[PDB]
Amino acid sequence: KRDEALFELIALEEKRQREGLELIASENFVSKQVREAVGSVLTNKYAEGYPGARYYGGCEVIDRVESLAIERAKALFGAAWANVQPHSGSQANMAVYMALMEPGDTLMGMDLAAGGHLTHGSRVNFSGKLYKVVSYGVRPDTELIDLEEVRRLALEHRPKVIVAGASAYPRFWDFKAFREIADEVGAYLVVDMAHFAGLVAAGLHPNPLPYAHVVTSTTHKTLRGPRGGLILSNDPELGKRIDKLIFPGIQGGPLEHVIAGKAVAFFEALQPEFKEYSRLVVENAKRLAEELARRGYRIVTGGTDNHLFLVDLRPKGLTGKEAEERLDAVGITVNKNAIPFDPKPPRVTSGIRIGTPAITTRGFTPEEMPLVAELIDRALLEGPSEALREEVRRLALAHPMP
Amino acid sequence: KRDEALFELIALEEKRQREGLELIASENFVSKQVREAVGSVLTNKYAEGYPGARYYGGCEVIDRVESLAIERAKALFGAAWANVQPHSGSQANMAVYMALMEPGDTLMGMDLAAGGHLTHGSRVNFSGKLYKVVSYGVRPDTELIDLEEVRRLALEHRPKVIVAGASAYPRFWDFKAFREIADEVGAYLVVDMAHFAGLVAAGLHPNPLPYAHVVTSTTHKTLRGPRGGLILSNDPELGKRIDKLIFPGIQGGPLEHVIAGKAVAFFEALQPEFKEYSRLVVENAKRLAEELARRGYRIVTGGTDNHLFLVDLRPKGLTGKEAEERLDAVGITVNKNAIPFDPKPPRVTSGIRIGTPAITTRGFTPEEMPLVAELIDRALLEGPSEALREEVRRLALAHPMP
């Protein structure tokens, strides 16, 4: 008997994705072949352990799948070791922290209000519950990270782990300087590259692998893979410690169907076409930010080096909750986002974050960003309307989905 | 450009699954429509938060999917609250432990060597790293749990949490007696029903919901759903606390394509045909155990109440490691398992664990269990041969996969 009610909801979600403009910076649209691998019979096999060292027999083909994902990840990022089993970016970070730290050690990460991720030390997250957290932010004038401030805080508090990487920071990171700071205090440098991993893969963002002790990531977001996590290092002895924290430390059976999807995504990212895609992601983001600034919006830091940017909505009298609602009403999806030194609580905020990976996958070009900027501006100034919703829908439908 | 190398391996794994007899008790084969949901475009959406209270716009359809999974889980198991976001059984347990305990509190669970899971207190797992662990086992003379010993340990060590449930225990649990013991020392009772959840759904195993404070599960194994976790309770106030530990406590974005898969599995399990399937699972296991006993093996506890049983190989002078290897060589997968107070070290053991869910899904019936018992016996006594492998392969191919 087919579950018609559930499949009707999936069809409605397909239609929603096709008919809207998805500008949430962490989203993307995966390829049919990634979906085919994730939908495969590999879900049926328990594969606790690692290739050639499994608990149970019958894994000879699964070992070749997992090993292919591991070796492609090493080739793609230039790493000596990879672990492809984490179920999510959160589990990747959790295993690394538990391998390098004991409860009550000091973790240093970027402040949530400045663009850090929940797992970089928030007090409602395991990171800020198990560890003592010290956070760094950005300067109030340039809105850039101040490496002198990072260095001062590290000397004063002597963290065991310093995390670089963030979920809403629009400029490049200086990984060499962060490693120099970590070395001054004997800390490990962990880089969480989840947001910009696909740009690293395409050579469009500095690679952290040579400077970080350990690198974590998601396989979704700019890498355009299935939802899951990933860990890399140039030190295979530290990698063996972390392998034990993934299993048997914090997970049980890995999702081998998802791992097959990660292998496929790494193969897609190794192709020349993925470099061209990634180039257009960054060109579209720069162009859309410029078109919005020409309409009088304030862009945090004045621009972007990567796939995302932040808009300060204080001057226009909007909370980010409000802008998020007005845009959602006409089919444009963003997320509210705290801006640097935000006057308003995190459930309201003063800004929005926009990113271009998802619309670039649908074939949007830099010459189309003036039209996208017009639609955003109208939704914010004039509020939602049926004519505006229809204009968004027409523009979205003119671009294929993968 | 298609990833030919990866899809070649998926076809080889499909062929392996089709041509072999899967007797590992944790395994099952999911339906095509569960795969279709897991392979869907719902992976593209970030949906941090809960239905009606998300951190991203554009979740109106995903909310209906996740709500449908929640309401079907509650109707299927007779629960007042559910959380369908855990990425795995291990994350379901981790969130419950962190919601109920502080690091350094005492956890009581079944010993790994007597059948407990890694997350019931093993020192290599987070459960034995964050918490102090007291374990209970089985009695040498009954091969069963001794509720008087559980009580004595609980009175002496005053655990904060007592876990009931196991990965390799072939008899019913007395959840009422466990809740009495927990009430006497002021502990929470957590039941991990992952292995026998499908039998609870079908009414063939006592339901823990009225007696546990919280129930955790996988959605794969006897429930025959996609790989993932699940939490249930009869107490919605405790459920709100655990919701917060799943997110933002230990996870980030949920896997909503897998959640849609869980919704389909719960739909399948609510059909009358699932009760018939589960009845056959239990009849097959009782019959296979009787047929091996008639050929000279001893069955631990003398039989089974559920989908799995433990074979004591001592009458035939084999170890569990040798039996696993001989059987794997003819395409029959089992796993070695210690017998109570095993005289062999744990990397060797004197037993194997066999379960029937997977072969029952392929249409095996109790009148075919004599033939399966004969093939096992021949492989253990004669050793692998090309002719025996071909007889297994023909028997397997005659029973279709879903």
Author numbering:
A (entry chain B), B (entry chain A): 6 to 407
Q: Could you pull the original sentences from the published paper?
A:
Serine hydroxymethyltransferase (SHMT), a ubiquitous PLP-dependent enzyme in the aminotransferase superfamily, catalyzes the reversible conversion of L-serine (L-Ser) to glycine (Gly), transferring a one-carbon unit to tetrahydrofolate (THF) to yield 5,10-methylenetetrahydrofolate (5,10-MTHF). SHMT is found as a homodimer in prokaryotes, such as Thermus thermophilus (Tth), and a homotetramer in eukaryotes, such as humans. Like many metabolic enzymes, SHMT is evolutionarily highly conserved, especially in the active site, enabling us to utilize SHMT from Thermus thermophilus (TthSHMT) as a model of the mitochondrial human enzyme.
We further tracked the substrate through the active site cavity by obtaining a room-temperature X-ray structure of a pseudo-Michaelis complex by soaking a TthSHMT crystal with D-Ser, a non-reactive enantiomer of L-Ser, which displaced the sulfate anion in protomer A occupying the cationic substrate binding site. The crystal soaking experiment produced a complex with D-Ser in protomer A replacing the sulfate, whereas protomer B retained the sulfate ion in the substrate binding site. Both protomers remained in the open conformation. Arg358 acts as the primary anchoring point, forming a salt bridge with the D-Ser carboxylate by making two H-bonds with the N···O distances of 2.7 Å and 2.8 Å. Tyr61* that interacts with the D-Ser hydroxyl adopts two alternate conformations. In the TthSHMT/D-Ser complex, the D-Ser α-amino group is 3.0 Å away from NSB but is angled away from C4′ at a distance of 3.5 Å, possibly making the nucleophilic attack unfavorable and producing the stable pseudo-Michaelis complex. Moreover, the Schiff base out-of-plane dihedral relative to the pyridine ring is flattened to 20° indicative of NSB being protonated and positively charged.
